[PDB]
Design a protein around this ligand. Structure first.
Ligand SMILES: COC[C@@H](O)c1ccc(C#Cc2ccc(C(=O)NC[C@H]3C[C@@H](NC(=O)[C@@H]4C[C@H](F)CN4)CN3C(=O)C3CC3)cc2)cc1
Ligand SMILES: [Zn+2]
Length: 296
């Protein structure tokens, strides 16, 4: 059968919060069957824990935020994308501060730290959410859709009127490596936006070392892009992180059109509410299942 996965070993990492500019110590820990992903602010006494579930998502600010009262964890989407891409079901994420470290601006450093630890299969069937019906959310010119699909696929389109800006990509993850083709795609920022955010005490940890910095015309990063389509690949990365707040891996297709965290969360809420549009399924036989995972 397809089995739940956690970490084999604890992972420790250091970085800076994109927005906070705060040094943050990150620990990923193995967790029991049916824990899901749980974030933990260990700088607090008592320690405050927020399950990485759509119901805990906060005011859809600059990034995906988990809240519980007046406690938050900022910018969870790149880490959850790394955990989604590798099929991790159960894990404790401990943070010394309010924001997940940005690292290089991609999921690459997290996927590497996790695959360095290795994964442990657990004695329990992995539960999948299978899309049975199309679920569509729109707001203005933005659109986010689930389509039934025997597998896992993410299609994305962006549309910037900007000299730097392939603005479309589709990845079937059963035939294309999240690790190689998506995970290294970095966050990006326009200089006019970054100058505004800085003026408002935001982007305090931003640098060419953790973001593609774009002025009116070109990428300012001396070493350029990792992919010709890095921008729309990063959109796909962020969508994979947000999808993982369902708390179960998806069997279906996601289509984004200029979508972002706020509409992505409207789509998760609408899917969860419409119980006719999905079912929980397990696979007693991995060989006939529409998705596959790497060796642990
Ligand atoms: C040494 O410093 C000195 C100096 O040079 C310097 C250099 C750099 C910085 C910085 C920085 C920085 C600040 C904010 C952002 C950001 O929010 N990007 C949003 C982008 C990326 C994507 N969204 C995402 O990736 C979401 C949102 C987060 F980005 C994570 N997930 C969607 N998206 C948009 O659609 C944009 C067009 C609206 C990125 C980088 C500061 C100072
Ligand atoms: Zn991002």
């Amino acid at each position: 059968m397809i089995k739940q996965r956690t970490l084999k070993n604890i992972i420790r990492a250091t970085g800076v919060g994109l927005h906070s500019g705060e040094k943050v110590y990150l620990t990923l820990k193995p967790a029991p069957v049916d824990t899901g992903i749980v974030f933990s602010r260990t700088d607090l006494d008592p320690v405050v824990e927020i399950p990485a579930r759509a119901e805990n998502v906060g005011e859809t600010t600059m990034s995906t935020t988990l809240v519980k009262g007046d406690v938050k964890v900022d910018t969870v989407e790149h880490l959850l994308s790394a955990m989604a891409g590798l099929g991790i079901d159960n894990a404790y994420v401990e943070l010394s501060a309010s924001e997940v470290p940005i690292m290089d601006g991609s999921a690459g450093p997290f996927v590497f730290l996790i695959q360095s630890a290795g994964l442990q299969e657990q004695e329990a069937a992995k539960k999948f959410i299978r899309i049975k019906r199309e679920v569509s959310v729109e707001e203005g010119d933005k659109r986010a859709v689930f389509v039934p699909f025997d597998g896992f696929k993410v299609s994305f389109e962006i549309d910037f009127d900007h000299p730097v800006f392939t603005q479309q990509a589709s990845v079937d993850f059963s035939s294309t490596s999240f690790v190689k083709e998506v995970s290294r795609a970095r966050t990006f920022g326009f200089m006019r936006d970054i100058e505004y955010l800085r003026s408002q005490n935001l982007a305090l940890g931003g640098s060419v070392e953790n973001a593609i910095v774009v002025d009116e015309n070109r990428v300012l990063n001396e070493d350029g892009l990792r992919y010709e389509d890095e921008f729309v690949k990063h959109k796909i990365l962020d969508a994979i992180g947000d999808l993982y707040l369902l708390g179960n891996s998806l069997i279906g297709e996601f289509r984004g059109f200029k979508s972002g965290h706020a509409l992505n969360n409207q789509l998760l809420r609408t899917l969860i509410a419409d119980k006719d549009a999905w079912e929980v399924v397990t696979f007693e036989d991995a060989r006939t299942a529409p998705i596959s995972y790497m060796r642990p």
